[PDB]
Design a protein around this ligand. Structure first.
Ligand code: FAD
Ligand code: FAD
Ligand code: PAB
Ligand code: PAB
Lengths: 394, 394
């Protein structure tokens, strides 16, 4: 079996990269450990930057998003009995963000790939990467008992945090940067109208709460929760009562509750690996970095890694400029670190930390008061929130 | 002995408040533990906000400052082999800061007070405050062996961090917020021309370094140093060698060195007390709060506490509106916390902290890169640096 670019992982990164590549004439095969249904079961992201929206258009998979996606021009932050609206559009010079679930984006990409007839092998078990520094790397996997080999020119590791690709780079070549937060997010998806037309991030003494949405009749809520929590300990009723206790009274009063369609706990963490490549293997998305959910940057950073990898590969195949691929890590890391800095800042000002001294609590509240009260403070949040510009390369 | 307002402390806070009060017809007496010469020996501050410059004019003690003070429109921040200039004037909408030593300001105030003939008692030993909640509070002190009593309507504690005034408020009425940093600043004053016409704050792997000045022929330099350091362990030559190792090569090459006129180590700390008053006692300046030197806010916050206390007292005496004095703490604390937040931020991004993990070092460098590279980031530094506006009261 032979292709030009082998892609490990059929989550959004792999599918998006594969679609862009296919449309430009660069053959690619995607290998995925799970089944289509398992992948489609992950709820995850809801907020997309303008850059990600443009990439989807370039891949030609934007019909449903243009119809069903909700364009947001602002977002609210509630703390100490007050709600402040950050006008993203005004403060960032006209940019906005789009709410369209990750599940939907993934569904759109999968349908698009099937229609073009590109190769995707699900239940590709025990994927192994070989001869990463040779001129002819290859991938081996198992499909129903038999071990098959796929030959390629390049390999893009789009296999998330627990993927095989990052594990295939000699540990000594990698530099790992990681921070584990002492809390997680308990999320609940419900077929109920959202409490507001814009998102509400809330810093409350009991902990963080976030009011989000998927559509006009589907909501997504989150509440900060200790790492010791087990989802079976949170009945729908306990969740709604908790959510209500963390929101401003006028917001909690008009909240329409309902049975959960999905309920799960996601731990918060920051993780960056440098560089993001080795030989003919290039890491993209969660395989190379994790950002806490607070800033809505994860899927958005995956998009920029992908936009960068695709353009460099195009240059390599179309223009014979294979040497430009060495710049991949340098280009992506500049954006990754600024997004990590923002996600980290959001996380530190919106959440309640264990054993915080009086001074730090006061500084936390003052950070909010300053950034939300100053025109310059507001603009730093807004420009970071809509997403810093992609770099052009070369 | 009787007066209207008793002032404990003849540092800048007490002298400035006393001058403003005298000029408006409100009699006041200042009690100081030390001698004029001891007070004049403290080097301390060099940077003044525009608000402090205007207050000095209002007190009529600005002749020498208008002649000798240096107006700065920018400041540099050096990190990772690069120097970035923050144009304060442009980014803050026209404000600047003035470099005029604290020693000089204090000298100007002392001469001004003597000329007007207002009362100042130096070597006032063992000052004690009494009947703080009565309608007739009083102060007792000792002058050459005999204990004297001073009767007054109000008492302004302008006695710094180690003063008697804050200690006179029942501890249970106070809420203390404090952070101790694991380092201090070793400062050196020299009769040498400064290395630059604007200040240079430097984040270097070896630690923080700051290049300041007092005039065209007098410089003030600082280098971060562990708390275990003793000044006798730092010869002038060791200091210059250390300073040079922390600055960009092109800056270290043109540095004119020379023997020190003063050398001392100041520990870094944050401290705020709430409220800032009790009965007829009002705390101002270092007596109520300490901010690390990094943001040049200490003397500047003392000025705003003083501007606020003076205007409220004027209202009380001239207009019989004694009830407005209850708003003192609320008004001052709003400004104090934002300045504390800024001083804290500056301190955390410019200094090298003990046992910092890889992630935090990278976040530190990224904070700099973001704030110094974004027009909105630059503006948050600049507006905070020149000093946020004073509140108007009532
Ligand atoms: C609570 C939550 C909220 C979030 N909210 C947002 C938000 O609003 N906005 C935003 O920008 N980001 C957000 N994110 C982040 C976003 O979900 C991720 O960054 C995104 O899923 C990254 O996609 P990916 O394709 O790189 O990896 P993944 O989605 O993890 O997909 C990787 C795929 O690789 C497959 N795979 C793994 N191992 C192998 C193997 N060995 N062989 C073959 N295939 C393999 C996996 O099965 C999976 O299909 C959120 C995440 C969470 C958890
Ligand atoms: C290294 C350094 C650099 C700084 N740099 C800057 C800068 O550039 N800009 C800026 O804004 N700030 C800066 N500051 C801060 C600034 O120096 C202080 O905030 C300022 O001195 C506050 O003045 P004050 O009058 O409140 O107190 P002080 O200057 O401490 O004076 C208090 C006075 O009260 C007297 N006193 C004490 N106890 C008694 C008693 N029991 N009875 C009677 N009298 C008593 C003392 O002797 C002293 O004279 C710096 C400080 C340091 C140490
Ligand atoms: N920051 C975030 C905002 C929204 C969501 C979500 O809608 O799922 C997740 C994270
Ligand atoms: N931030 C500071 C800037 C300058 C000085 C000083 O000149 O003494 C002190 C602190």
């Amino acid at each position: 079996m032979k292709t030009q670019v082998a892609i490990i992982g059929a989550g959004p990164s792999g599918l998006l990269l594969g679609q862009l590549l296919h449309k430009a004439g660069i053959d690619n095969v995607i290998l995925e450990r799970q089944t289509p249904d398992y992948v489609l079961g992950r709820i995850r992201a809801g907020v997309l930057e303008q850059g990600m929206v443009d990439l989807l258009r370039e891949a030609g998979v934007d019909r449903r998003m243009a119809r069903d996606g909700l364009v947001h021009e602002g977002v609210e932050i509630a703390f100490a009995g007050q709600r402040r609206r950050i006008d993203l559009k005004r403060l960032s010079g006209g940019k906005t963000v789009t709410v369209y679930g990750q599940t939907e984006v993934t569904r759109d990409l999968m349908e698009a790939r099937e229609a073009c007839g590109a190769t995707t092998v699900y239940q590709a078990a025990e994927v192994r990467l070989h001869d990463l520094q040779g001129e002819r790397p290859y991938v081996t996997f198992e499909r129903d008992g038999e071990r098959l080999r796929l030959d390629c020119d390049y390999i893009a590791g789009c296999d998330g945090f627990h993927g095989i690709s990052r594990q295939s780079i000699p540990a000594e070549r990698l530099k790992v940067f990681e921070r584990v937060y002492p809390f997680g997010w308990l999320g609940l998806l419900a077929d109920t109208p959202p409490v507001s037309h814009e998102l509400i991030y809330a810093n409350h003494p009991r902990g963080f709460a976030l009011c989000s949405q998927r559509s006009a009749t589907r909501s997504r809520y989150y509440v900060q929760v200790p790492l010791s929590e087990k989802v079976e300990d949170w009945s729908d009723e306990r969740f709604w009562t908790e959510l209500k206790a963390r929101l401003p009274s006028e917001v909690a009063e008009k909240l329409v509750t309902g049975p959960s369609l999905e309920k799960s706990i996601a731990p918060l963490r920051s993780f960056v690996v440098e560089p993001m490549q080795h030989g003919r293997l290039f890491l993209a998305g969660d395989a190379a970095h994790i950002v806490p959910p607070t800033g809505a940057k994860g899927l958005n950073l995956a998009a920029s890694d992908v936009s960068t990898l695709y353009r460099l590969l195009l240059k390599a195949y179309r223009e014979g400029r294979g040497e430009l691929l060495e710049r991949y890590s340098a280009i992506c890391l500049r954006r990754i670190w600024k997004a990590e800095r923002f996600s980290w800042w959001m996380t530190s000002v919106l959440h309640r930390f264990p054993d915080t001294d009086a001074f730090s609590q006061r500084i936390q509240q003052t950070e909010l008061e300053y950034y939300l009260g100053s025109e310059a403070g507001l603009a730093t949040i807004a420009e970071n929130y809509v997403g810093l510009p992609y770099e052009e390369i070369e």
